[PDB]
Amino acid sequence: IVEGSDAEIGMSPWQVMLFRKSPQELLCGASLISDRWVLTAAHCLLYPPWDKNFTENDLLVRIGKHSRTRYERNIEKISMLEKIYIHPRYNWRENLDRDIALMKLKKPVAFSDYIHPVCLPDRETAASLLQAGYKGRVTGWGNLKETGQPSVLQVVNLPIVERPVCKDSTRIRITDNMFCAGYKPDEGKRGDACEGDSGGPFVMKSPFNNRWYQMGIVSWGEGCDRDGKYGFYTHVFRLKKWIQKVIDQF
């Protein structure tokens, strides 16, 4: 996260860390959506142009973490992957369309003050909150600068940006399965997700029921926190049918 701030303890208890077994490193962010399902970006597990194709046994999920590098004894829980599920139409060839994936855990994770699932939006949460101007919150342990690393979880609040402005910021083809978020140059305020924040959640707090909903997944960008550029996010509600299908079936 660039130009964000340290997370508060228990501020994002759905936050998940995708952690590579060997070499032991940060793979990506992710989100806890129930006691056995974790949501992330497909590009975190599959990206052929970069020779990325991870299977279940190549990683673990670390839940309830704050410190990036520390093994947080008696706080985090580390869980093994039973099965990975990537959107069958995930378009890694061109624009990361449908950049989404589910991970089923071997065993349920126990909720705690530090471990708690985020809600997924329904059609009305989406219509109500996914509006240009409205801010979301992005969290992760990624790069503090486009080109260093944080000691603890970073957080940044960012406004959702108008669709034409998103489209006019990039040569990449944008779809209905994406939205972009970030401050304009003229607004002065800064911030962005960056490398390593991939797969982490973009959340909004409903003013109606005071619950946190995950509206986006950190998907892509061109550089980090650059003027005139915006972070792009997987539109979670637009891919809800697939989420429920996977979870209903498996």
Partner: peptide, 27 residues
């Protein structure tokens, strides 16, 4: 069901330092 409600914040009626900024943007 209890999704989205943080033990150390909503569940205890405590606000984090910036969630207000989000609220003020929901017009």
């Amino acid at each position: 069901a209890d999704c989205g409600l943080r033990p150390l914040f909503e569940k205890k009626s405590l606000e984090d330092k910036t969630e207000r900024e989000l609220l003020e943007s929901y017009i």
